[PDB]
Amino acid sequence: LMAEQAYRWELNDDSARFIKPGAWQGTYAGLLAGETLMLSLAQMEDAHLKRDKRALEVERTVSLAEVYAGLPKDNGPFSLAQEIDKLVSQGSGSAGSGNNNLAFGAGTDTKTSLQASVSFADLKIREDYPASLGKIRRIKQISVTL
Amino acid sequence: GNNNLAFGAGTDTKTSLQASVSFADLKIREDYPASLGKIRRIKQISVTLPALLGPYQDVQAILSYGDKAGLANGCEALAVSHGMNDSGQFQLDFNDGKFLPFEGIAIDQGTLTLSFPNASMPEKGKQATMLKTLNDIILHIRYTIK
Amino acid sequence: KTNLSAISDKQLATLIRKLNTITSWLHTQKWSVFQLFIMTSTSYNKTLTPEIKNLLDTVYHGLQGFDKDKADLLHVMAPYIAATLQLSSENVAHSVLLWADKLQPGDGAMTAEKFWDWLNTKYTPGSSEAVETQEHIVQYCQALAQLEMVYHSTGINENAFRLFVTKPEMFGAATGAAPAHDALSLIMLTRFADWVNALGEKASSVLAAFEANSLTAEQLADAMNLDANLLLQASIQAQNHQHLPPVTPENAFSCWTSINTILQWVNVAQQLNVAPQGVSALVGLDYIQSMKE
């Protein structure tokens, strides 16, 4: 069942379950129980390679000072230059709104920490390619530069 | 013919601009004596795009084959990310069991099409301003003789 | 079902003959009356048993995830039935399942599709619970086990049992009806098995020629080490005389009832140590009747 979670996360088939409860039977001392799991794993590997295909590896730079500077005006648009250097000097306050807000930590140990939040819904990355290129888009690796 | 440069036919590709070229016009089979070897097959196609991409800004473009049948599942197209001797993958390894994209494809016949999504300035496509700076395209064809 | 109080004299004589024949057959077979009643029984006990529970658990576990269009349900279900019901061969279980589907056992007519659907929906393995349809499931399982007791007691070969299940007409049962496990059918099945055993090594070719419409007098005579002319003339005499069911050249070696009639003629002729024409002359001596001269 740990290999089945690995399958259900390397692919997206959260519904697909291959391990059945019938592998052990106390009537017959549980004999041949392992060979039923061996068949289940063989079915899991066969379906796994049957469904797997080469995916288009892509990378995209996000400029956070642009994602906040371009913020729709129903939220207050701001460049990070003029709020980082006052929410430090005041140690307090907030800027922006929704999931794109920039503000200090809520919890008692985070009260000093300053965290900048952004929504992937506003990165709008799904617009950058035709839809028929592929229906599911998934992160491989997030790298940060400061 | 197959060397035309034109916009996409399908409803989502109507913004995308794709440049097609025939391997028959690359005439690569002429570059060596015939008795050196009768079959010539692609090992790896690399693309380079010497536009004036900005700092922390990138192109998106996608070169695809024409058959989509003879070849392993998903090996028929790779997408360029940054366009400087750049293939579709993040680390390429010739020792890996994976077939690289465009592997085993015959040189003599075939069509290669490179597409640029969101080209049309009437739709304010993200590439529109940068694609004007695009002068020329380079393919690095890794092919083997046997 | 017939009552002895209100019965005809000829009907009573027929009943006496039937009882005597069946008693003689049981004595030859070393069989008790209770065993014959069990093999010919139709009422089934509606009580869950550990053997039936194990059968249900094994079938449910094996058939889980089965796809109807991918393969036949009966063929997929056969191996688990063979394992649970203590069978030597898988195809014996497949034939038994076909026979049960034709019989539709129990008070609630049960079949493989209905059994599979009930197991898929209303069955929870490993727990003792009361289900309204559970008694019909038990009856169907009991019928399957009884048809095993049939197959093993008869001693017939697996492929001729398959033929009997699939084509009762070849065994001369009434056309278009499921084969009966009635004692009347049991005795003829036993006689067929005994004749096959008597054929010895030739049986392998004889049965193959019988399953096609291929068998002839000469091949069967070679098989039984009898004269071909003897079998041909016995068949001719059987065709000439009015049997019920009638014997015609196109069934004389195609239906088992016709082969049995011909063999009875041959046995009676060799008992009297005369040709079949001798028996033909004998049976003409109906001197105590008004039907004919």
Side-chain angles (χ1 to χ4, degrees), chain A residues 51-68:
Chain A
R51 294 264 287 100
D52 276 338
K53 86 183 302 172
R54 160 167 287 101
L56 314 167
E57 293 83 3
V58 172
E59 65 183 1
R60 179 187 206 291
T61 300
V62 179
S63 180
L64 183 56
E66 191 177 66
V67 165
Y68 293 176

Side-chain angles (χ1 to χ4, degrees), chain A residues 53-54 56-57 59 129 132, chain B residues 12 58 73 75 77 82 88 99:
Chain A
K53 86 183 302 172
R54 160 167 287 101
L56 314 167
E57 293 83 3
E59 65 183 1
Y129 285 93
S132 58
Chain B
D12 52 352
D58 55 0
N73 178 34
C75 298
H82 54 78
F99 281 107

Side-chain angles (χ1 to χ4, degrees), chain C residues 39-292:
Chain C
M39 294 183 287
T40 56
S41 177
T42 317
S43 298
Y44 300 140
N45 50 2
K46 42 180 67 65
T47 289
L48 199 61
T49 72
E51 197 271 330
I52 287 168
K53 191 183 292 184
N54 294 340
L55 182 147
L56 293 169
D57 292 333
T58 300
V59 170
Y60 169 79
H61 291 108
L63 267 74
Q64 194 168 4
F66 159 80
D67 200 4
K68 308 164 149 31
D69 58 351
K70 287 191 181 171
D72 187 19
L73 168 75
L74 203 62
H75 203 47
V76 176
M77 195 168 55
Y80 306 104
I81 295 293
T84 52
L85 273 188
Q86 298 93 21
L87 282 81
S88 186
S89 177
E90 315 299 327
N91 204 18
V92 175
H94 188 200
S95 289
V96 160
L97 273 167
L98 284 148
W99 193 9
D101 290 327
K102 291 183 180 191
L103 277 170
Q104 298 186 342
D107 298 334
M110 191 63 70
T111 60
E113 158 188 21
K114 289 171 68 176
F115 179 62
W116 162 238
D117 295 330
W118 181 91
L119 271 178
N120 207 1
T121 58
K122 312 196 174 145
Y123 186 73
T124 301
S127 306
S128 73
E129 287 181 352
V131 184
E132 61 273 15
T133 306
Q134 195 172 5
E135 61 185 1
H136 303 127
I137 301 299
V138 169
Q139 277 172 353
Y140 184 60
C141 285
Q142 285 286 336
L144 283 170
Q146 178 197 59
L147 292 186
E148 308 316 328
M149 186 176 173
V150 168
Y151 174 71
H152 294 84
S153 298
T154 45
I156 193 170
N157 75 82
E158 160 175 346
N159 190 59
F161 184 64
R162 176 146 276 283
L163 166 70
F164 171 77
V165 168
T166 55
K167 291 186 282 287
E169 294 81 9
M170 193 81 76
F171 279 85
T175 188
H181 61 287
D182 176 2
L184 178 50
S185 181
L186 278 190
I187 180 157
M188 61 79 71
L189 262 178
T190 297
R191 272 188 296 200
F192 178 88
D194 292 331
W195 171 64
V196 171
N197 291 329
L199 295 164
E201 299 186 358
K202 290 276 195 175
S204 65
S205 177
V206 167
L207 266 297
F210 176 65
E211 177 159 36
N213 280 300
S214 176
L215 186 60
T216 76
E218 302 89 352
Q219 178 172 9
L220 195 149
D222 194 11
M224 293 177 70
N225 294 324
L226 291 159
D227 207 344
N229 275 324
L230 188 153
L231 281 179
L232 283 159
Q233 295 206 12
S235 171
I236 288 154
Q237 295 307 321
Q239 288 160 2
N240 292 131
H241 297 90
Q242 185 171 2
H243 294 86
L244 283 72
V247 181
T248 184
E250 73 269 29
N251 64 7
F253 300 101
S254 177
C255 177
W256 170 243
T257 302
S258 297
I259 295 172
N260 195 8
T261 299
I262 290 176
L263 293 187
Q264 283 177 29
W265 269 74
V266 170
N267 286 322
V268 165
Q270 291 200 105
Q271 169 77 37
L272 293 176
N273 203 1
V274 297
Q277 277 69 241
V279 183
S280 164
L282 180 55
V283 297
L285 306 184
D286 282 322
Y287 74 102
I288 301 184
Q289 52 73 40
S290 63
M291 174 187 291
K292 61 181 175 186

Side-chain angles (χ1 to χ4, degrees), chain C residues 5 7 26 29 32 176 191 201 241:
Chain C
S5 179
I7 200 183
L26 285 185
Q29 294 281 311
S32 177
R191 272 188 296 200
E201 299 186 358
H241 297 90

Side-chain angles (χ1 to χ4, degrees), chain A residues 83-102:
Chain A
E83 286 82 4
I84 283 170
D85 78 359
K86 80 184 296 181
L87 282 49
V88 167
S89 306
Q90 299 173 0
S92 190
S94 179
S97 292
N99 291 115
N100 309 312
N101 51 355
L102 183 155

Side-chain angles (χ1 to χ4, degrees), chain B residues 43-56:
Chain B
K43 179 52 53 179
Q44 195 269 135
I45 299 177
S46 278
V47 59
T48 295
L49 299 181
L52 284 68
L53 304 179
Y56 309 114

